[PDB]
A = this chain, B = another copy of it.
Amino acid sequence: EPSVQVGYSPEGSARVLVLSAIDSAKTSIRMMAYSFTAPDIMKALVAAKKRGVDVKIVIDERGNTGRASIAAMNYIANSGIPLRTDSNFPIQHDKVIIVDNVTVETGSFNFTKAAETKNSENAVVIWNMPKLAESFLEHWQDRWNQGRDYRS
């Protein structure tokens, strides 16, 4: 039952794999991000929202004050997706997507265009490991709990 997929950048497989993970969501998505700017990633998250997926995101505050960050943050908030900034860590550095409480995407891959087509990166999706995803959820929840809502 448990399995693992891997993708890389700038090859193109990391981006597609991460999109695959978000597109697979049927019930929930709990995301943690440092840089938060990739438009195609944002498009995918709100389509999941539209699909009825319970989406909640906590991102690093200090590293998300740029124009692209704000455009992505506004777009996400505008779609009804609960979103929070976290500044309690010099850097909330995780690049993680927990899907349906049993799957975990993680790796070096930040959700930016640079991570999609320029930097060398890796993204893995560990499918169906309830125990692993619940542990990650506690990680996500601790950071989310100390974040500041970003609403639209």
Contact = CB atoms under 8 A, between A and B. Distances in A.
Interface in A97-121: 106-110, 114-115, 118-121
Interface of A: 2, 4, 6, 8-10, 32, 34, 86, 89-96, 106-110, 114-115, 118-122, 124, 126, 129, 132, 135-136, 139, 143
Number of copies: 2
Given A8-B139, A132-B4, A135-B6, A106 B124 contact: yes
Contacts of A122: 94, 96, 106, 136, 139
Nearest to A86: B120
Contacts of A126: 4, 124, 126
Given A4-B126, A4-B129, A139-B8, A120 B93 contact: yes
Interface pairs A-B: 8 shortest CB-CB: A93-B119, A91-B119, A89-B120, A92-B120, A93-B108, A94-B108, A93-B121, A90-B118
Given A89-B119, A91-B118, 12 more contacts: A4-B132, A6-B132, A8-B139, A9-B93, A32-B120, A92-B119, A93-B115, A106-B106, A107-B108, A108-B108, A122-B139, A124-B132
